[PDB]
Amino acid sequence: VWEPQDWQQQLVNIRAMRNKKDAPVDHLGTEHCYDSSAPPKVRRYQVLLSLMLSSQTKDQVTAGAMQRLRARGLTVDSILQTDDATLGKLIYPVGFWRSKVKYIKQTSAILQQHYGGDIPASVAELVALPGVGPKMAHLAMAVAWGTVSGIAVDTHVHRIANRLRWTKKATKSPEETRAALEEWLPRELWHEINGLLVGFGQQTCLPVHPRCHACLNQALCPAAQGLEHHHH
Numbered sequence: 001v002w003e004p005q006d007w008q009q010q011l012v013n014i015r016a017m018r019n020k021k022d023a024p025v026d027h028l029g030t031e032h033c034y035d036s037s038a039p040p041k042v043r044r045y046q047v048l049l050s051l052m053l054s055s056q057t058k059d060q061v062t063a064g065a066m067q068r069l070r071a072r073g074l075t076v077d078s079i080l081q082t083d084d085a086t087l088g089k090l091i092y093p094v095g096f097w098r099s100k101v102k103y104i105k106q107t108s109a110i111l112q113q114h115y116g117g118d119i120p121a122s123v124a125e126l127v128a129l130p131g132v133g134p135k136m137a138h139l140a141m142a143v144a145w146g147t148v149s150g151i152a153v154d155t156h157v158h159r160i161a162n163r164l165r166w167t168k169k170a171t172k173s174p175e176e177t178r179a180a181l182e183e184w185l186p187r188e189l190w191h192e193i194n195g196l197l198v199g200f201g202q203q204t205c206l207p208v209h210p211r212c213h214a215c216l217n218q219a220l221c222p223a224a225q226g227l228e229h230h231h232h
């Protein structure tokens with residue numbers, strides 16, 4: 001097998017310097033319509049709802065309905081206790097909002113009775129829900145459960161993997177790093193590691209002259225002794 005020495009400690013340090021979550025790539029490409037303080041189970045329900053309200057709809061109109069639902073408190077119970085007319089005025093004016101009221105109310109009842117208040121964990125069960133198609137199912141599996149086919153390795157993930165030495169030996173291409181990372185990384189982190197490291201490289205682990213003087217892995221990063229610059 002393989003376990004990068006002090007990776008679980010290096011990971012939570014990357015999470016700490018990332019707790020602000022203010023990097024360009026993620027904000028361009030992540031979803032902000034979820035309560036950050038919500039427990040993981042409530043978050044998964046908010047992910048599914050945000051996907052069911054994005055069929056031919058502006059992202060500002062979509063995020064505007066999420067922020068209105070979060071303002072009242074967005075849980076499976078609060079939705080089931082909301083009448084159809086009230087929920088209609090809330091998500092209005094998202095596209096096809098009348099059908100989406102029926103979709104959300106019925107799906108929330110299916111989750112409460114057959115899933116203990118959680119969302120399904122397979123594409124086949126997700127697409128069986130009213131208003132959930134195959135495109136939404138694969139996005140829900142990736143954002144809510146972290147299930148992805150493979151680790152998406154770009155220049156940032158390839159650079160940080162060789163700096164922290166998360167591979168057996170120094171890889172030569174981002175594709176060689178993918179097979180080395182998939183040897184040991186838990187699958188629930190395969191999707192989260194892309195949204196975390198790419199933003200980490202943009203803000204701290206820069207391609208040249210990284211901010212090792214303000215990085216928590218200064219004692220954990222093996223190659224930090226060669227990139228730390230005092231005059232920088």
Ligand code: SF4
Nearest residue numbers: 205210212215221224
């Ligand atoms: S100390 Fe420097 S090289 Fe090591 S992880 Fe932090 S930014 Fe990257």
